[PDB]
Structure formats: C-alpha cells, structure tokens
Amino acid sequence: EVYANCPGLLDEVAMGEMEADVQALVRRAARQLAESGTPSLTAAVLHTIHVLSAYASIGPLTGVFRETGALDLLMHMLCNPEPQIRRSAGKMLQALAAHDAGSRAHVLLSLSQQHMDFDSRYTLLELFAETTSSEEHCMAFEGIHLPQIPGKLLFSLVKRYLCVTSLLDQLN
C-alpha cells in the first residue's frame, strides 16, 4: 500500500549505549532519591532528571527506555515529595508520550493503584491533561453544548479510557 500510494516515505550502537548509560544514571538518581534529605543531593537529582529527560528526547529508542525498566523508577519519582522535581518529571513523561502511548497508559495506570485526595485526583487529572496534549486527542470541539459531568464521574471515565487505550495498543 505504501508502494502504491506513497513510496518515497518508505548506528543504533550509540542509541543502546545511551540507553545503558541512562540506566546507570537512573540508578544514581534513585541513589540520590534515597539520599534526598539534603538539598545539595536534591539539586544534583534535579540535574540528573534533566539529563534523563534529554535522554528521553529521542524518538525511536522507546523500546529500550521501557526495557531498562525506567517506568517504575519514574513512578517512584512521581511519589517523591520533591515538587519541582515532580513537575520536571511530568514534563519528561509528556515528552516521552509523543513517541508511544502504551508507556503513558501503563505509567498512569500504575500511578492510580497507590476516596483519594482531591489533590491526588487533581494530580491524576493534570497528568492526563499532559497526556491529552497528544495529537490523538487533538481534535475540534463540537461547537455545540457539551454538558458538564461531575468530578468522580470524570475519574471513572479517565480510568476506563486509560485501560482501553492500553489494551488497544497491547493487541498489536
């Protein structure tokens, strides 16, 4: 079909090396996170997280990025009391999102399993907005009356759709 419609559209050693290096960096970052009782190591961890995001800026290496098991470390980082670092990690995850959806789905899904706090539900909603910055959710409004639903209903709908998208990608 590509041959018929658009044929024209048709060195990973460094990629895998950076993946392993990011694995070591995440190990050091978790070491700092366990040591996150002094603001010097906290600042160093913030710098490490910036480096981790820059590593995440690559397109095709998402397979390695999940392969190194960075997801659980990132999830733990989201449960850290470092608010600025939490925001930075959220930005990094959002930058990761464009590459693939399944990573986002699994990340938020595991993030759910922690009458939760309205602040906690707010955190889930903010992360989902960061996700919904995706092109798949990028579409036009109906220009018509979209009735407003309640909040806990919004939580239920978000959880449902997240699992849906996860599985739908998973069937591939």
């Binding site: 309205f118 989902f128 907005a129 407003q148 639903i149 919004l154 759709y161």
Partner: protein, 133 residues
C-alpha cells in the same frame, strides 16, 4: 412545577437533603435549570437555600461554580449564597481542567470507534462489540 407546587417540592427537597447518600443518586439533575431560574420571592429564596445546602461534596459545588451563574447571583442579590460566592466563585482551575478533560474524552472515544471501523474493513469480519450499535 408551579410556584406553590414547586414550593412544596422545594420544601421536600430541602428536608430530605439530610441524607448521607442524597448525592449517591444522580444529584446533578436540574442544577443548571435551577441556576437558570435563579423569579418569585419563594423561588429565589428556595434557589438560594438549595445552593447553600449544596455549599457543603466540595467538587459538587465546584461543578456548580463551573456552571458559573455569578452574574445572575449578583442580580438576584441586588434584587433583595454569600458563602458560596466566597468559596465556589473565584476557583476556576477546576473549571478549565474539567472542560478540557471532557472534550478530550469525547474526541478520543470517537477516534477509537473510527479506527475499529477501518480495522474491520481490513479484516472483513463483521463488527461485534457490546453496546456499540
């Protein structure tokens, strides 16, 4: 219904508001029409009373503020509440978030449906998914 009939109905609603699961039902039934009507002196008093009763599910009052009839509230106040005007009004982060989320859910569901239609076009097997029709 009518001013007297709606007055008796409002009396019943205000009395039964004492439930702990009064919101377990679809409590967001006519809040929007209530804000639209919010009138007769009994009607305005009852709308204010219902709002004050709802002032305590904070997210429910947040949805009320998302409805955002603050201008009508000001007009009705000038015609003759305050706690809701303090708490619910001037908290709109919730509002923008929830609006964006609702639109996003709609768009995503639609895209999923269309994609499945195309996939079944490819496979030729008939579509059979619960409640899809």
């Amino acid at each position: 219904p009518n001013k007297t009939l709606l007055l008796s109905v409002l009396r019943v609603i205000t009395r039964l508001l004492d439930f702990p699961e009064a919101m377990v039902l679809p409590w967001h039934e006519v809040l929007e029409p209530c804000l639209n009507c919010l009138s007769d002196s009994e009607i305005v008093q009852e709308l204010t009373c219902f709002l004050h009763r709802l002032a305590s599910h904070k997210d429910y009052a947040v949805v009320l503020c998302c409805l955002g009839a603050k201008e009508i509230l000001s007009k009705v106040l000038d015609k003759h509440g305050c706690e809701l005007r303090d708490l619910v009004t001037e908290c709109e982060k919730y509002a923008q978030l929830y609006s964006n989320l609702t639109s996003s859910i709609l768009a995503g569901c639609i895209q999923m449906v269309l994609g499945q239609i195309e996939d079944h076009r490819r496979t030729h097997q008939p579509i059979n998914i619960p409640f899809f029709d």
